[PDB]
Amino acid sequence: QVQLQESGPGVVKSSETLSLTCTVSGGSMGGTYWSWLRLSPGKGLEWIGYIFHTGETNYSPSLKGRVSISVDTSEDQFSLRLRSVTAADTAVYFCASLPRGQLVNAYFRNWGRGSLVSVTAASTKGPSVFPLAPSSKSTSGGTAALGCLVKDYFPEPVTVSWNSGALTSGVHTFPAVLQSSGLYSLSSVVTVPSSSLGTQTYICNVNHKPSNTKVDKKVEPKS
């Protein structure tokens, strides 16, 4: 009967202030700690802070100094502001509520649906491409993995091929990770017969259209 609605998802430019609001429908604004939490791959589910109708706040020690929460007890709304965001602040942000009182056994109720906030860099940057060399060791009938590390580019996407498209079997290009810097990296690996090393040449072809960069890198066995 009580529903919380967060402001929609958006993008915030790295270094700026993340700003969200939660609107409360049903019940009263009293008797409650109006709360914010977030969920991300890199830090899991985290409580951020809460506010009581009097305006008294409590914040995670991890964010104390750059987080602020406010409430409007007539408009039934509360806010989250988080200063100096970096890529690490990319997460799904949730509002929720806790009953006023002792918290040792308390659980969050009336969660909002969540709003994805992506903290994004601004400037284009082409990748560096490093070989991921296979061993020159001999497996009797076995395979070796070799690849290319496509490091520190922005924005997405990067495409990768092998031997200009002539090699497709055993090729697996992995989705990118986002570093704290706001730059992406990914890897492409091909699984080949270990006997083909030293016979067949393997070149990764990396395209980053946003920076108008292409790189070809031969990947050879560790010397």
């Binding site: 589910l45 995670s60 659980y107 969660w111 590390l149 992995f174 990770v177």
Partner: protein, 206 residues
């Protein structure tokens, strides 16, 4: 600090799911989290059910380990489950989360491939360890990095598992080091946990 949960718990249609939450000194509650939906508590004070939650959800706690049980797990129960405890300093601490899956294909444990920093990267005054994880099901894993035998959390980035062509899942994890850190340690390892299995690979400077 997070409470430790298995990344993946899965059952055949008809079976009961058991999810553990370790490191909890006081009472635990559990949230069901699905993509794009409001989380909701399913169990609080270790085993108590809020109104509206079906009978098949139950709980137990012994010492510092809490368990969530879902009897005759149904499609509607498929979700990520997070445990939570109160904390004197942080107010609330949560578990790492457990994906619950009803198996649509056989369980498959990951293949792990670990590459050391390339000589080229070291020449650019950087160092990246690359851990590739593939051919697993269900699509949830925990990746842990070690310097020698000690856990390393800083400089780690890990992707959310994505479906491959063969309908299994893959993921990758990266550890950023300085060349000095790379050269001064005996070895670094990537350890992947999935269901009953752990796979660790280790590399060392040359």
């Amino acid at each position: 600090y997070e409470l430790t949960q298995p990344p993946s718990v899965s059952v055949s249609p008809g079976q009961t799911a058991t999810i553990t939450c370790s490191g909890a000194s006081t009472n635990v509650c559990w949230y069901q989290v699905k993509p794009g939906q409001s989380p909701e508590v399913v169990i609080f004070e270790n085993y108590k059910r809020p109104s509206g939650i079906p009978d098949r959800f139950s709980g137990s706690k012994s010492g510092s380990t809490a368990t969530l049980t879902i009897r005759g797990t149904q499609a509607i129960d498929e979700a990520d489950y997070y445990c939570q405890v109160w904390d004197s300093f942080s107010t609330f601490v949560f578990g790492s989360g457990t994906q619950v899956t009803v198996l649509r294909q056989p369980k498959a444990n990951p293949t792990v491939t670990l590459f050391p920093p390339s000589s080229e990267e070291l020449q650019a005054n950087k160092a990246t360890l690359v851990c590739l994880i593939s051919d697993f099901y269900p699509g949830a894993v925990t990746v842990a990095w070690k310097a020698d035998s000690s856990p390393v959390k800083a400089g780690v980035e890990t992707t959310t598992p994505s479906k491959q062509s063969n309908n299994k899942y893959a993921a990758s994890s990266y550890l950023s080091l300085t060349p000095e850190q790379w050269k001064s340690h005996r070895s670094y390892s990537c350890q992947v946990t999935h269901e009953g299995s752990t796979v660790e690979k280790t590399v060392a400077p040359t």
